[PDB]
Amino acid sequence: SERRDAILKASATAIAQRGIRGLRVNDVAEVAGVSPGLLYYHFKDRIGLLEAALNYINDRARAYRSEGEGSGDSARDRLTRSLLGEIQDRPEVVENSLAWNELRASAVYEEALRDPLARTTAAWVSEIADAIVQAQATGEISRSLDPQPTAVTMTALVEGLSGRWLCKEISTEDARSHLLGAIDVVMS
Amino acid sequence: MSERRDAILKASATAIAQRGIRGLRVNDVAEVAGVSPGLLYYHFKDRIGLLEAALNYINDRARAYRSEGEGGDSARDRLTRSLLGEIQDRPEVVENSLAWNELRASAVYEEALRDPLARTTAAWVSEIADAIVQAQATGEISRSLDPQPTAVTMTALVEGLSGRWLCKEISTEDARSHLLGAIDVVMS
């Protein structure tokens, strides 16, 4: 239902602005424009809600990273879309990445969020790792790179730079240029 | 008073690591530290002064682990020790990492935290940049690397890996190995 989506979008804004710690269902209910009873009806409990919101935000992120996909795109093209996709000045990209940044931070103490975060992050890593393996078969990328470690490292860098970006500690342009520099290093 | 400033900051680091910025209370910190709230305000003025000083305390503590064993002569030796020293199964390193993780996440939505965090992060970045510049003069590193962006990138990589490490999403030994491979790629 479009109400579920609307609830989830509002929850991601509550998450983004207030942070997860001490966020309660009634707070979320207030921003979502529904009662806590309806909210529990859709999501069962607070963790069910956070996990639904994490899945919603992951889906939008996946879209941002796949914008402009094309048949038989180069390794460079694949790495670039997936690494840069979530750091853009477009307002709904920023809102989405703010909420993901907080969910990543919260999972240190919200242990029930660790599994969905690990699995969705595994799927991002896997995109990069696959791009590398395909290129290594052709020679287009150094064969001495270990694909999975390289992909885990490149995406963790995105998370680190994105945390600074969201602090306004580094510009959008600089964060993207650093990532491009990393990609250049891997192709060279 | 300098023994007492240190007790205050040590207790502040623990409060931040365990309870986050919202769970940090002057009265509790001061009680932990065996001092009065008024002494804390005398040295640090206010809650933002406290947090600024705690950011620097944590960075000073991390710096000790970054240089442990130092001078371990090569640029490679110094860079490796610095980057790997951030991620270790030692109680102080874990705590520093948790507290930094909290501060980095909170500064997104608490704007007052941004300037101190930027200044402390800039100091960490500078140790790494200086290492790279020194090594380009000796020729231990490609003169191709721009020191500042590289140092920004490497330290950002430590923060991204640490965020996953603290969620138990990546093991300590995996995170260390990936930092080593990153340094290798940069040292090539």
Side-chain angles (χ1 to χ4, degrees), chain B residues 15-30 32-69:
Chain B
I16 299 164
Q18 289 303 115
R19 291 184 274 174
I21 286 326
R22 54 203 318 297
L24 177 83
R25 285 196 74 246
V26 165
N27 274 12
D28 301 325
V29 171
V32 174
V35 301
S36 72
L39 180 69
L40 187 155
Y41 295 128
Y42 188 69
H43 290 307
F44 302 109
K45 187 192 181 212
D46 53 20
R47 186 178 150 283
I48 195 57
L50 178 63
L51 291 170
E52 175 172 311
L55 274 156
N56 280 327
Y57 184 78
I58 291 159
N59 189 48
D60 290 348
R61 210 155 62 169
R63 201 168 50 257
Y65 291 94
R66 288 196 293 260
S67 53
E68 192 180 14

Short mmCIF file of all heavy atoms in Angstrom, two decimals, chain B residues 15-70, unseen atoms left out:
data_model
loop_
_atom_site.label_atom_id
_atom_site.label_comp_id
_atom_site.label_asym_id
_atom_site.label_seq_id
_atom_site.Cartn_x
_atom_site.Cartn_y
_atom_site.Cartn_z
N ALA B 15 31.40 7.43 28.65
CA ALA B 15 30.02 7.85 28.51
C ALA B 15 29.62 8.00 27.06
O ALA B 15 28.58 7.48 26.59
CB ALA B 15 29.81 9.19 29.29
N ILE B 16 30.45 8.67 26.31
CA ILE B 16 30.17 8.77 24.89
C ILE B 16 30.13 7.42 24.19
O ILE B 16 29.18 7.15 23.45
CB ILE B 16 31.10 9.75 24.19
CG1 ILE B 16 30.92 11.16 24.83
CG2 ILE B 16 30.75 9.78 22.65
CD1 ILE B 16 32.06 12.15 24.50
N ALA B 17 31.15 6.58 24.41
CA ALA B 17 31.21 5.27 23.79
C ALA B 17 29.96 4.40 24.10
O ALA B 17 29.46 3.68 23.21
CB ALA B 17 32.50 4.53 24.20
N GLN B 18 29.49 4.48 25.34
CA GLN B 18 28.50 3.54 25.85
C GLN B 18 27.06 4.01 25.70
O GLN B 18 26.16 3.18 25.50
CB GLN B 18 28.76 3.29 27.37
CG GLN B 18 30.05 2.46 27.62
CD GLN B 18 30.04 1.09 26.90
OE1 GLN B 18 30.86 0.81 26.00
NE2 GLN B 18 29.11 0.22 27.32
N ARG B 19 26.86 5.32 25.82
CA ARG B 19 25.52 5.91 25.96
C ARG B 19 25.26 6.98 24.88
O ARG B 19 24.15 7.49 24.73
CB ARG B 19 25.39 6.53 27.36
CG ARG B 19 25.36 5.52 28.56
CD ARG B 19 25.12 6.27 29.92
NE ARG B 19 26.37 6.77 30.52
CZ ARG B 19 26.46 7.53 31.63
NH1 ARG B 19 25.36 7.91 32.31
NH2 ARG B 19 27.66 7.92 32.07
N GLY B 20 26.29 7.27 24.11
CA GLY B 20 26.27 8.28 23.07
C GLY B 20 26.28 9.68 23.65
O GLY B 20 26.24 9.87 24.86
N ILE B 21 26.29 10.66 22.76
CA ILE B 21 26.18 12.07 23.14
C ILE B 21 24.94 12.39 24.02
O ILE B 21 25.06 13.12 24.99
CB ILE B 21 26.39 12.94 21.83
CG1 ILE B 21 27.87 12.94 21.42
CG2 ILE B 21 25.76 14.31 21.83
CD1 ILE B 21 28.84 12.89 22.58
N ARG B 22 23.77 11.82 23.72
CA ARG B 22 22.57 12.04 24.58
C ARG B 22 22.66 11.38 25.97
O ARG B 22 21.93 11.77 26.91
CB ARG B 22 21.31 11.56 23.89
CG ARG B 22 21.38 10.11 23.42
CD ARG B 22 20.39 9.83 22.30
NE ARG B 22 19.10 10.47 22.54
CZ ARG B 22 18.30 10.18 23.57
NH1 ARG B 22 18.69 9.26 24.45
NH2 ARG B 22 17.13 10.81 23.71
N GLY B 23 23.54 10.39 26.11
CA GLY B 23 23.63 9.67 27.38
C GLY B 23 24.71 10.22 28.28
O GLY B 23 24.84 9.77 29.44
N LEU B 24 25.48 11.17 27.74
CA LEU B 24 26.51 11.91 28.45
C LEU B 24 25.84 12.98 29.32
O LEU B 24 25.21 13.92 28.80
CB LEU B 24 27.45 12.61 27.47
CG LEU B 24 28.57 13.52 27.99
CD1 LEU B 24 29.81 12.73 28.41
CD2 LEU B 24 28.99 14.53 26.90
N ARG B 25 26.03 12.86 30.62
CA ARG B 25 25.50 13.82 31.53
C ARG B 25 26.69 14.32 32.39
O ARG B 25 27.50 13.52 32.90
CB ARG B 25 24.42 13.14 32.38
CG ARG B 25 23.06 12.87 31.68
CD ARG B 25 21.98 12.59 32.77
NE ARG B 25 21.53 13.78 33.51
CZ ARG B 25 21.71 14.04 34.82
NH1 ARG B 25 22.34 13.19 35.63
NH2 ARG B 25 21.26 15.17 35.32
N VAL B 26 26.82 15.64 32.50
CA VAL B 26 27.89 16.28 33.33
C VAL B 26 27.97 15.73 34.75
O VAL B 26 29.07 15.44 35.26
CB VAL B 26 27.70 17.81 33.35
CG1 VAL B 26 28.51 18.49 34.46
CG2 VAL B 26 28.07 18.38 31.96
N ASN B 27 26.82 15.54 35.37
CA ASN B 27 26.77 15.04 36.75
C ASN B 27 27.30 13.63 36.88
O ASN B 27 27.99 13.30 37.85
CB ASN B 27 25.35 15.06 37.26
CG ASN B 27 24.96 16.38 37.84
OD1 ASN B 27 25.68 17.38 37.68
ND2 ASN B 27 23.82 16.41 38.53
N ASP B 28 26.97 12.80 35.88
CA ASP B 28 27.44 11.42 35.89
C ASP B 28 28.95 11.34 35.61
O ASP B 28 29.69 10.65 36.35
CB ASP B 28 26.62 10.55 34.93
CG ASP B 28 25.13 10.55 35.26
OD1 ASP B 28 24.75 10.60 36.46
OD2 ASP B 28 24.32 10.48 34.32
N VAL B 29 29.39 12.06 34.57
CA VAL B 29 30.81 12.20 34.21
C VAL B 29 31.61 12.68 35.41
O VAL B 29 32.60 12.06 35.84
CB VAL B 29 31.01 13.21 33.05
CG1 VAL B 29 32.52 13.52 32.85
CG2 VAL B 29 30.43 12.66 31.78
N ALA B 30 31.16 13.78 35.98
CA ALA B 30 31.84 14.29 37.17
C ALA B 30 31.85 13.28 38.33
O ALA B 30 32.88 13.09 38.99
CB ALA B 30 31.23 15.62 37.54
N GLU B 31 30.73 12.60 38.61
CA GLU B 31 30.72 11.54 39.63
C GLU B 31 31.72 10.42 39.27
O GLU B 31 32.55 10.04 40.08
CB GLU B 31 29.33 10.95 39.81
CG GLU B 31 28.46 11.65 40.79
N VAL B 32 31.67 9.92 38.03
CA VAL B 32 32.63 8.90 37.62
C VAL B 32 34.04 9.38 37.89
O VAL B 32 34.88 8.62 38.43
CB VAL B 32 32.46 8.46 36.13
CG1 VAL B 32 33.58 7.51 35.71
CG2 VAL B 32 31.13 7.75 35.95
N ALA B 33 34.28 10.67 37.63
CA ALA B 33 35.63 11.17 37.63
C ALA B 33 36.11 11.53 39.03
O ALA B 33 37.27 11.88 39.19
CB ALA B 33 35.83 12.37 36.62
N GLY B 34 35.21 11.46 40.01
CA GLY B 34 35.50 11.78 41.40
C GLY B 34 35.66 13.28 41.59
O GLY B 34 36.43 13.75 42.48
N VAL B 35 34.97 14.06 40.76
CA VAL B 35 35.06 15.53 40.90
C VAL B 35 33.68 16.18 40.95
O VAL B 35 32.70 15.50 40.78
CB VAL B 35 35.91 16.14 39.77
CG1 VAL B 35 37.36 15.51 39.80
CG2 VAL B 35 35.24 15.90 38.40
N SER B 36 33.61 17.50 41.14
CA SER B 36 32.35 18.19 41.19
C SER B 36 32.00 18.68 39.79
O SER B 36 32.88 19.02 39.01
CB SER B 36 32.45 19.40 42.11
OG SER B 36 33.23 20.41 41.46
N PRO B 37 30.70 18.76 39.47
CA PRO B 37 30.27 19.46 38.25
C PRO B 37 30.95 20.84 38.08
O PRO B 37 31.35 21.15 36.98
CB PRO B 37 28.76 19.63 38.49
CG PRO B 37 28.42 18.36 39.26
CD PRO B 37 29.57 18.18 40.22
N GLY B 38 31.12 21.64 39.16
CA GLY B 38 31.69 22.98 39.04
C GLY B 38 33.15 22.94 38.55
O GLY B 38 33.63 23.86 37.82
N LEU B 39 33.87 21.89 38.91
CA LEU B 39 35.27 21.80 38.40
C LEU B 39 35.25 21.55 36.93
O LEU B 39 36.08 22.09 36.17
CB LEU B 39 36.08 20.72 39.09
CG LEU B 39 37.53 20.58 38.61
CD1 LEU B 39 38.39 21.80 39.04
CD2 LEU B 39 38.13 19.31 39.06
N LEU B 40 34.30 20.71 36.51
CA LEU B 40 34.19 20.38 35.09
C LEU B 40 33.89 21.67 34.27
O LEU B 40 34.54 21.95 33.23
CB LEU B 40 33.15 19.24 34.93
CG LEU B 40 32.97 18.61 33.56
CD1 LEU B 40 32.42 17.16 33.72
CD2 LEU B 40 32.01 19.53 32.76
N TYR B 41 32.95 22.48 34.77
CA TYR B 41 32.65 23.74 34.11
C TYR B 41 33.77 24.77 34.17
O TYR B 41 33.95 25.55 33.22
CB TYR B 41 31.41 24.39 34.70
CG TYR B 41 30.14 23.61 34.50
CD1 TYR B 41 29.31 23.32 35.58
CD2 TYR B 41 29.72 23.25 33.24
CE1 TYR B 41 28.10 22.62 35.40
CE2 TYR B 41 28.53 22.55 33.05
CZ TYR B 41 27.72 22.25 34.15
OH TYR B 41 26.53 21.60 33.98
N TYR B 42 34.50 24.80 35.28
CA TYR B 42 35.71 25.62 35.34
C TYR B 42 36.72 25.27 34.23
O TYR B 42 37.28 26.16 33.60
CB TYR B 42 36.38 25.52 36.71
CG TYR B 42 37.52 26.51 36.87
CD1 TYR B 42 37.29 27.91 36.94
CD2 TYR B 42 38.83 26.05 36.95
CE1 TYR B 42 38.37 28.82 37.07
CE2 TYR B 42 39.90 26.95 37.05
CZ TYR B 42 39.65 28.32 37.13
OH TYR B 42 40.72 29.18 37.26
N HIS B 43 36.98 23.98 34.01
CA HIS B 43 37.99 23.64 32.97
C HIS B 43 37.48 23.68 31.57
O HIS B 43 38.25 23.94 30.65
CB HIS B 43 38.58 22.24 33.19
CG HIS B 43 39.47 22.16 34.39
ND1 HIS B 43 40.52 23.03 34.59
CD2 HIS B 43 39.47 21.32 35.45
CE1 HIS B 43 41.12 22.74 35.73
NE2 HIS B 43 40.51 21.70 36.27
N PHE B 44 36.22 23.34 31.36
CA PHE B 44 35.71 23.11 29.99
C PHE B 44 34.57 24.06 29.58
O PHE B 44 34.14 24.06 28.44
CB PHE B 44 35.29 21.64 29.85
CG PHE B 44 36.44 20.68 30.13
CD1 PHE B 44 36.45 19.90 31.29
CD2 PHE B 44 37.52 20.58 29.23
CE1 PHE B 44 37.53 19.02 31.54
CE2 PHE B 44 38.61 19.70 29.49
CZ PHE B 44 38.59 18.92 30.63
N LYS B 45 34.11 24.85 30.55
CA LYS B 45 33.15 25.95 30.41
C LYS B 45 31.72 25.49 30.30
O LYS B 45 30.84 26.01 31.01
CB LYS B 45 33.48 26.90 29.23
CG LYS B 45 32.57 28.12 29.20
CD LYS B 45 32.66 28.92 27.90
CE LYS B 45 31.73 30.14 27.99
NZ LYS B 45 31.24 30.39 26.60
N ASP B 46 31.48 24.58 29.37
CA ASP B 46 30.12 24.18 29.01
C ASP B 46 30.17 22.81 28.31
O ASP B 46 31.26 22.20 28.14
CB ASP B 46 29.41 25.27 28.16
CG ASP B 46 30.23 25.69 26.95
OD1 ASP B 46 31.12 24.91 26.55
OD2 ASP B 46 29.99 26.81 26.43
N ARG B 47 29.00 22.29 27.94
CA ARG B 47 28.93 20.95 27.37
C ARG B 47 29.64 20.87 26.02
O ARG B 47 30.35 19.89 25.77
CB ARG B 47 27.48 20.45 27.29
CG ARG B 47 27.36 19.00 26.85
CD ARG B 47 25.88 18.56 26.85
NE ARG B 47 25.61 17.54 25.83
CZ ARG B 47 25.47 17.79 24.52
NH1 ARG B 47 25.56 19.04 24.05
NH2 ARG B 47 25.22 16.79 23.69
N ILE B 48 29.51 21.88 25.17
CA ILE B 48 30.29 21.84 23.91
C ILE B 48 31.82 21.91 24.17
O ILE B 48 32.59 21.23 23.49
CB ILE B 48 29.79 22.89 22.83
CG1 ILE B 48 30.34 22.59 21.44
CG2 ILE B 48 30.08 24.36 23.20
CD1 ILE B 48 30.00 21.18 20.88
N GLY B 49 32.24 22.73 25.13
CA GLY B 49 33.70 22.75 25.50
C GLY B 49 34.17 21.38 25.97
O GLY B 49 35.27 20.94 25.63
N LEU B 50 33.33 20.68 26.75
CA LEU B 50 33.61 19.31 27.21
C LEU B 50 33.81 18.37 26.02
O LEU B 50 34.79 17.60 25.95
CB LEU B 50 32.50 18.78 28.21
CG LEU B 50 32.65 17.31 28.75
CD1 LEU B 50 33.93 17.19 29.57
CD2 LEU B 50 31.45 16.78 29.58
N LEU B 51 32.90 18.45 25.05
CA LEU B 51 32.92 17.50 23.92
C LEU B 51 34.13 17.78 23.03
O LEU B 51 34.83 16.84 22.58
CB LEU B 51 31.61 17.60 23.12
CG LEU B 51 30.35 17.09 23.84
CD1 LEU B 51 29.08 17.44 23.09
CD2 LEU B 51 30.40 15.61 24.08
N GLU B 52 34.37 19.06 22.76
CA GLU B 52 35.58 19.47 22.03
C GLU B 52 36.82 18.88 22.69
O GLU B 52 37.62 18.25 22.05
CB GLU B 52 35.72 20.98 21.98
CG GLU B 52 37.06 21.38 21.31
CD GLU B 52 37.19 22.89 21.03
OE1 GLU B 52 36.26 23.48 20.45
OE2 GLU B 52 38.24 23.48 21.38
N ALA B 53 36.96 19.06 24.00
CA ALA B 53 38.11 18.52 24.70
C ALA B 53 38.14 16.98 24.69
O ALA B 53 39.24 16.37 24.61
CB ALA B 53 38.19 19.09 26.16
N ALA B 54 36.97 16.34 24.72
CA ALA B 54 36.90 14.87 24.62
C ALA B 54 37.29 14.37 23.22
O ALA B 54 38.00 13.40 23.08
CB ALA B 54 35.50 14.33 24.96
N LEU B 55 36.82 15.05 22.18
CA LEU B 55 37.32 14.75 20.85
C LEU B 55 38.85 14.75 20.84
O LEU B 55 39.47 13.79 20.37
CB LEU B 55 36.74 15.76 19.86
CG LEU B 55 35.37 15.44 19.28
CD1 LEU B 55 34.68 16.74 18.82
CD2 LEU B 55 35.51 14.43 18.10
N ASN B 56 39.49 15.79 21.38
CA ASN B 56 40.95 15.88 21.32
C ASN B 56 41.65 14.81 22.19
O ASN B 56 42.70 14.26 21.79
CB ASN B 56 41.42 17.28 21.70
CG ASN B 56 41.29 18.26 20.56
OD1 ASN B 56 41.44 17.89 19.35
ND2 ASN B 56 40.97 19.49 20.90
N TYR B 57 41.09 14.54 23.37
CA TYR B 57 41.56 13.47 24.26
C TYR B 57 41.61 12.10 23.52
O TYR B 57 42.63 11.42 23.55
CB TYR B 57 40.63 13.42 25.47
CG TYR B 57 41.07 12.40 26.51
CD1 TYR B 57 42.11 12.69 27.38
CD2 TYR B 57 40.48 11.13 26.56
CE1 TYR B 57 42.54 11.76 28.32
CE2 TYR B 57 40.91 10.18 27.51
CZ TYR B 57 41.93 10.53 28.38
OH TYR B 57 42.38 9.64 29.35
N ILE B 58 40.50 11.74 22.87
CA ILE B 58 40.36 10.48 22.12
C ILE B 58 41.41 10.44 20.99
O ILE B 58 42.10 9.40 20.76
CB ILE B 58 38.90 10.38 21.57
CG1 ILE B 58 37.92 10.18 22.75
CG2 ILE B 58 38.75 9.27 20.56
CD1 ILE B 58 36.48 10.57 22.40
N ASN B 59 41.56 11.58 20.32
CA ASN B 59 42.59 11.67 19.23
C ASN B 59 44.02 11.53 19.78
O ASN B 59 44.84 10.81 19.19
CB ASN B 59 42.47 12.98 18.45
CG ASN B 59 43.39 13.00 17.19
OD1 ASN B 59 43.40 12.05 16.42
ND2 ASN B 59 44.19 14.03 17.06
N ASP B 60 44.32 12.21 20.88
CA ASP B 60 45.57 12.01 21.60
C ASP B 60 45.81 10.57 22.02
O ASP B 60 46.91 10.08 21.87
CB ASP B 60 45.67 12.91 22.84
CG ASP B 60 45.84 14.39 22.47
OD1 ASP B 60 46.12 14.70 21.28
OD2 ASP B 60 45.69 15.23 23.34
N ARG B 61 44.78 9.92 22.56
CA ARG B 61 44.87 8.50 22.90
C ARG B 61 45.14 7.60 21.67
O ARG B 61 45.98 6.67 21.74
CB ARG B 61 43.58 8.06 23.61
CG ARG B 61 43.78 6.94 24.61
CD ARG B 61 42.69 6.92 25.71
NE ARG B 61 41.36 6.70 25.14
CZ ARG B 61 40.29 6.42 25.86
NH1 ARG B 61 40.42 6.36 27.20
NH2 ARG B 61 39.11 6.22 25.25
N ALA B 62 44.43 7.87 20.56
CA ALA B 62 44.57 7.10 19.30
C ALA B 62 45.97 7.31 18.74
O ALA B 62 46.61 6.37 18.31
CB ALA B 62 43.54 7.58 18.28
N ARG B 63 46.43 8.55 18.74
CA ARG B 63 47.81 8.87 18.36
C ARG B 63 48.88 8.04 19.05
O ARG B 63 49.81 7.59 18.37
CB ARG B 63 48.12 10.35 18.49
CG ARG B 63 49.32 10.76 17.61
CD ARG B 63 49.47 12.25 17.48
NE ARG B 63 49.44 12.91 18.78
CZ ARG B 63 48.41 13.58 19.28
NH1 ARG B 63 47.27 13.71 18.58
NH2 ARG B 63 48.52 14.11 20.50
N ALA B 64 48.76 7.83 20.36
CA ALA B 64 49.65 6.91 21.08
C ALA B 64 49.66 5.48 20.47
O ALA B 64 50.72 4.84 20.41
CB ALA B 64 49.29 6.84 22.55
N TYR B 65 48.49 4.97 20.06
CA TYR B 65 48.44 3.64 19.43
C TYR B 65 48.94 3.73 17.97
O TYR B 65 49.47 2.75 17.45
CB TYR B 65 47.05 3.01 19.52
CG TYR B 65 46.65 2.61 20.95
CD1 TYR B 65 45.91 3.47 21.77
CD2 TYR B 65 47.01 1.37 21.47
CE1 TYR B 65 45.55 3.11 23.08
CE2 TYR B 65 46.65 0.98 22.79
CZ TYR B 65 45.92 1.87 23.58
OH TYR B 65 45.59 1.50 24.89
N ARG B 66 48.78 4.90 17.33
CA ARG B 66 49.25 5.09 15.95
C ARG B 66 50.78 5.09 15.82
O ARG B 66 51.35 4.79 14.73
CB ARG B 66 48.68 6.38 15.37
CG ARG B 66 47.24 6.24 15.08
CD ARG B 66 46.75 7.34 14.17
NE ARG B 66 46.74 8.69 14.73
CZ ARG B 66 45.66 9.30 15.23
NH1 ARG B 66 44.49 8.68 15.27
NH2 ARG B 66 45.75 10.54 15.67
N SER B 67 51.45 5.46 16.90
CA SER B 67 52.91 5.55 16.88
C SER B 67 53.58 4.49 17.76
O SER B 67 54.82 4.45 17.87
CB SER B 67 53.37 6.97 17.27
OG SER B 67 52.78 7.39 18.51
N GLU B 68 52.79 3.59 18.36
CA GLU B 68 53.34 2.55 19.24
C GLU B 68 54.41 1.71 18.52
O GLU B 68 54.13 1.10 17.48
CB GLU B 68 52.24 1.65 19.81
CG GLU B 68 52.72 0.73 20.95
CD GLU B 68 51.60 -0.16 21.52
OE1 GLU B 68 50.54 -0.27 20.86
OE2 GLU B 68 51.77 -0.75 22.62
N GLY B 69 55.63 1.71 19.07
CA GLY B 69 56.77 1.02 18.47
C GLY B 69 57.63 1.86 17.53
O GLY B 69 58.63 1.37 17.00
N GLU B 70 57.28 3.15 17.38
CA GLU B 70 57.71 4.04 16.28
C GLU B 70 59.19 4.16 15.99
O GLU B 70 60.02 3.66 16.76
CB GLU B 70 57.17 5.46 16.50
#
